[PDB]
Design a protein around this nucleic acid. Structure first.
Ligand SMILES: [Mg+2]
Ligand SMILES: [Mg+2]
Ligand SMILES: [Mg+2]
Ligand SMILES: [Mg+2]
Ligand SMILES: [Mg+2]
Ligand SMILES: [Mg+2]
Ligand SMILES: [Mg+2]
Ligand SMILES: [Mg+2]
Ligand SMILES: [Zn+2]
Lengths: 201, 61, 136, 116, 48, 86
RNA sequence: CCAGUUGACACAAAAUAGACUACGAAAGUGGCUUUAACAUAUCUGAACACACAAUAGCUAAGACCCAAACUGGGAUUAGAUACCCCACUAUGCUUAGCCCUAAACCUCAACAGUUCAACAAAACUGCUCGCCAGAACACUACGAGCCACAGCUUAAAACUCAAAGGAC
């Protein structure tokens, strides 16, 4: 046990403190406080989705470089958008979108596997058991699929930022590798319309 | 369900049953002795059954 | 309020379901076998309405008599029946297996409503001595 | 009602047959039977079936079968909540049977006296 | 246990029931519908 | 075959709640005494094994009745600390 | 010529009562009707005898829903001649003959009466038929007897033993 049973983490929330509650505040005060970390700095730029994306992209414990590469890839995507809009052609703001929130929503929509797979044998033969999953597990699986697809590391020619940008642009328009993997998972789950009762939990 | 009471002899019930079974118009029917002839054994409800009257040895174990 | 007691056919069944007499509601035979489940909706005059068994689903093994597969087969049978006009039926269960309540739930999902849960399972009063005993 | 049991054991005075051959002595133990728990049932059957039907009608897109996938996810969340509620009630309130500890303590207060 | 009759009385009742079932004075696999007007004699557990 | 067709074992249903009618039919079958009969008829019950099954069933039933009587008799004591003397 | 309603529909037995101790010397016998009836108002009394007697196996008499040893195969282990499945011969049966076994164990003998080594069903008082007082050899050979011919009833002998055996 490297963590001491005395010291405890703090609470970084502060926007709500701008106007029962007093008792909760006194309780929070009467708590062995600790310092905040640098990697998971819960600041204004701490986006949970992008934070988890950078954490997964973290290699050798270099979250700084991961976040820098993520920001650079987003900037490159926006630069391609400008080339299609402002940089090269004339500003056509009526048929072009520069908001990555739409891409993030489309991903959350069409990149979530709603059926898990666990090899649960019964006697001496593995059987696929389609078991439902909650929202947290589904979002985690979606993020993991997106990240492991962006991190191909097998083309032996494409670079990390180029790979990420190309895969994101391919998955944006309701296609790409992540959505195809989701469709394959759905088909596999459909293929087991009877082997969905061998679950111990 | 016609009921024809009679006083047939002792060794004739099987013969009468066979004759009835031989008939075509008769569905079926077992010739049973008169029910009121059976003298009822005067019973008086259920008696209080006692508990177990010793079924195991007496040992501390 | 709705007597579950045996509704004899005597004068007269004063309960209609969308214009249907209890003595003429189409029958729905559902054989709930141990490792199989069949949905054979036989009409009153012995006519077809939804003979959708697990064999036509795709698998021909123990996957027949299960839960989700049985419910999907029941939903398909209910859809096929509604395509011909049935809705209300008198379920006639046969055998004990997973295709007992799952089939009824699937039929309800499709659209067919159950009015009576009849079961004509084989009850041999010490007649046909069943198969011998077996070990594991 | 408690049925008869005199002419059922092999005893000295008893001249009948032992129709009841208990494998263990008939002594009301100080404990009670334990209530079963856990069972591989895999709930969520109607929503699974309707989702399968929708996916059969359509393909595998989430924007097409949204009306059914939302209900499927809601039913999965409800099943998880019911599992949590059952796990909590296992220590708070038991449905059907009572806590075996209650009867255990009650019998401990006034245990059996077969050995006189 | 539920009906609450004696040994001899219950034996005679079941013997008469069996005789009626064999000869043909009572349905075997169901109850006579022409004589349903019967007060709550036994404690019918089913249907409460 | 020679008996009337649809009269017995006809548990009606209403209100679209087949679960209620299902449970009613289950209770009826259990109180009648045929579910276990069919379950044992699934295979051949040897006469020795059949007598052993009947004996065990009778013993368990007597024990359960005795336990239920004892519970109904002793369920009164369920307070906490009425005296508090010790 | 298989799965689901209905129509001429099993030479085997009856489910809830079976949550009843009921009847027999024992095994054993419960859906109904019957032909007859279970000795002893003193007890025990033959394995030199008389009556027999769960199932098991056989010779004919017909086959059955089902199963049916051995058998054929399927997946199976180095090996399966077994554990899962399909069908079957004698067979589970009666109509005619048997052989004469059992964990026939409730392993507590019958008659009248009273208040412990341990598991079990606490002890017995008076009388009576049978049996035993080491284990494998020994449900055996040799004799004797049997409608039984790889069978059955009693049944040993030499060698080895420092033992065999029941309860906790
Ligand atoms: Mg016969
Ligand atoms: Mg004998
Ligand atoms: Mg057969
Ligand atoms: Mg063999
Ligand atoms: Mg044969
Ligand atoms: Mg015996
Ligand atoms: Mg003597
Ligand atoms: Mg002797
Ligand atoms: Zn009575």
């Amino acid at each position: 046990s490297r963590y001491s049973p005395e010291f405890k983490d703090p609470l970084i929330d502060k926007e709500y403190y701008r106007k029962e509650e007093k008792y909760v505040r006194e309780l929070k005060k009467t708590q062995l406080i600790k310092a905040a970390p640098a990697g998971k700095t819960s600041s204004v730029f701490e986006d949970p989705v992008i934070s988890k994306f950078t954490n997964m992209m973290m290699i050798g414990g270099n979250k700084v470089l991961a976040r820098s590469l993520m920001i650079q890839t987003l900037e490159a995507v926006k630069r391609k958008q400008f080339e299609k809009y402002h940089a090269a052609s004339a500003e056509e703001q009526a048929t072009i979108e520069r908001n990555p929130y739409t891409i993030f929503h489309q991903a959350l929509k069409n990149c979530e596997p709603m059926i898990g797979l666990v090899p649960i044998l019964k006697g001496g033969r593995f059987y696929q058991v389609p078991v439902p999953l909650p929202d947290r597990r589904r979002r985690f699986l979606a993020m993991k699929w997106m990240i492991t697809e962006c991190r191909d590391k097998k083309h032996q020619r494409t670079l990390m930022p180029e790979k990420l940008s190309h895969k994101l642009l391919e998955a944006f328009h309701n296609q790409g590798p992540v959505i195809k993997r989701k469709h394959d998972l759905h088909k596999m789950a459909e293929a087991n319309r009877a082997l969905a009762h061998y679950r111990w939990w | 369900y016609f009921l024809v009471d009679f006083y047939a002899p002792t060794a004739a019930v099987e013969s009468m049953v066979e004759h009835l079974s031989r008939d075509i118009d008769v569905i079926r029917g077992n010739i049973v002795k008169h029910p009121l002839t059976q003298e009822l054994k005067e019973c008086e409800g259920i008696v209080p059954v006692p508990l177990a009257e010793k079924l195991y040895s007496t040992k501390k174990r | 309020k709705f007597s579950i007691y045996p509704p004899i056919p005597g004068e007269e069944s004063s309960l209609r379901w969308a214009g249907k007499k209890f003595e003429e509601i189409p029958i729905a035979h559902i054989k709930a076998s141990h490792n199989n489940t069949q949905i054979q909706v036989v009409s009153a005059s012995n006519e077809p309405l939804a003979f959708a068994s697990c064999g036509t689903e795709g698998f021909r093994n123990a996957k027949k008599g299960t839960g989700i597969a049985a419910q999907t087969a029941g939903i398909a049978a209910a859809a096929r029946a509604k395509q011909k006009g049935v809705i209300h039926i008198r379920v006639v269960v046969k055998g004990l297996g997973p295709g007992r309540l799952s089939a009824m739930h699937g039929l309800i999902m499709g659209g067919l409503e159950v009015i009576s849960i009849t079961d004509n399972t084989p009850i041999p009063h010490n007649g046909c001595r069943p198969r011998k005993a077996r070990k594991l | 009602a408690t049925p008869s049991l005199r002419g059922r054991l092999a005893r000295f005075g008893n001249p009948r047959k032992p129709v009841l051959k208990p494998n263990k002595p008939l002594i009301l133990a100080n404990r009670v039977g334990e209530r079963r728990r856990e069972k591989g049932e895999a709930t969520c059957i109607t929503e699974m079936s309707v989702m399968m039907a929708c996916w059969k009608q359509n393909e595998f897109r989430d924007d097409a079968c949204r009306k059914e996938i939302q209900g499927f996810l809601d039913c999965a969340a409800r099943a998880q909540e019911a599992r949590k509620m059952r796990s909590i009630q296992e220590t708070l309130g038991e449905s059907g049977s009572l806590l075996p500890n209650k009867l255990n303590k009650l019998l401990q207060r006034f245990p059996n006296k077969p050995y006189l | 246990h539920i009906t609450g009759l004696c040994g001899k009385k219950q034996k005679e009742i079941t013997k008469a029931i069996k005789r009626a079932q064999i000869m043909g004075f009572m349905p075997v696999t169901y109850k006579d519908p022409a004589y349903l007007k019967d007060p709550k004699v036994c404690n019918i557990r089913y249907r409460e | 075959a020679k008996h009337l067709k649809f009269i017995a074992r006809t548990v009606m249903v209403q209100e679209g709640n087949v679960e209620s009618a299902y449970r009613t039919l289950n209770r009826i079958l259990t109180m009648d005494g045929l579910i276990e009969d069919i379950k044992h008829r699934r295979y051949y019950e040897k006469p020795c094994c059949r007598r052993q099954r009947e004996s065990y069933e009778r013993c368990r039933r007597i024990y359960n009745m005795e336990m239920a009587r004892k519970i109904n008799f002793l369920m009164r004591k369920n307070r906490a600390d009425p005296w508090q003397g010790c």
